[PDB]
Write a protein that binds this ligand. Structure first.
Ligand SMILES: O=C(O)c1ccc(COc2ccc(F)c(Cl)c2)o1
Ligand SMILES: O=C(O)c1ccc(COc2ccc(F)c(Cl)c2)o1
Lengths: 163, 163
């Protein structure tokens, strides 16, 4: 609840279990980590007054997923932008000090109506916490934007912690 | 419509653009390809009489995503099992002979209620085509199973081809 932004090094520390400590929420390490920094996190405000995350991923043409997805037609997998939103909701639950390992539990409607090309500069994630329930889980809405343009929406993202 | 099963080599050929030809549907190449084989594909039968895919991914402890997701807590990313279902619906649209590049457009409800651990042997995907629309797109329901046990469901998977 004290720290409201996180550098890449903080997120890498998180991925090693060294931010929330052993048995608690971990981000993936590269190459599954789909966030470079958390610009903002809070447990108040946002769309529902239950908190907000703003996070960023820098794009360059050499990110691994461009070469294989697809050959001659590079586009950041939609599933990985979706996963960034699950990664962030899991981070939020750990950041609130809850114990346990994070799992995505699913979502309501997901829409992909644009793409991240290797010519893009920056992807921004906006997460609005809707509800937490203490079987500890969070429900959230999320958007993915590239260089100012909204391209994905997700309603009812669900993440749980397992102890 | 003639070939009803596909080996890993066929899928790798598909990823290089060499199965449906240039500008048509491509699977991802490794390490984004989340299918080893298509056991069955048809444009008739399934839950809605509009066709079915059955596909498999062999699991071993050395698959790349176990090491980074998460460190000390290996589990196949749910987002990649979801992506296998988008990959298969895209394959179906190309297999029917439609032109254009594949994009996931989203889904209705996704649920993850189990996990793929590095001790699992085989993941099976079952896709039921619900509807196609000719702006060419397919709508489908999907399940992910590990060693006989259903663990994920997705309703209203959507994939489109872009010409
Ligand atoms: O991994 C994918 O399939 C993926 C990433 C992003 C998308 C969506 O692609 C597009 C791309 C352009 C469009 F206009 C629309 Cl309606 C969707 O699909
Ligand atoms: O990438 C993930 O977060 C991921 C993959 C699979 C899952 C779901 O994990 C579980 C694992 C055990 C359970 F009992 C439930 Cl209801 C969900 O989450």
């Amino acid at each position: 609840t004290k720290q409201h932004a996180f550098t890449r090094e903080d997120l890498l520390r998180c991925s090693r279990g060294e931010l929330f400590g052993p048995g608690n929420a971990q981000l993936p390490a590269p190459n599954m980590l789909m966030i470079d920094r958390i610009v903002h996190i809070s447990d108040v405000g946002g769309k529902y007054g239950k908190g907000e995350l703003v996070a960023e991923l820098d794009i360059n043409p050499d990110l691994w997923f461009f070469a294989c997805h697809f050959e001659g037609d590079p586009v950041m997998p939609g599933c990985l932008g979706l996963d960034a939103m699950w990664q962030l909701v899991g981070f939020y639950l750990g950041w609130q000090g809850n114990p346990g390992r994070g799992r995505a539990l699913g979502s309501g409607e997901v829409k992909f109506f644009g793409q991240v090309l290797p010519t893009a500069k920056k992807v921004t994630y906006n997460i609005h916490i809707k509800r937490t329930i203490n079987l500890v889980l969070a429900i959230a809405d999320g958007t993915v934007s590239v260089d100012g343009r909204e391209i994905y929406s997700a309603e009812g993202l669900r993440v749980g912690l397992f102890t």
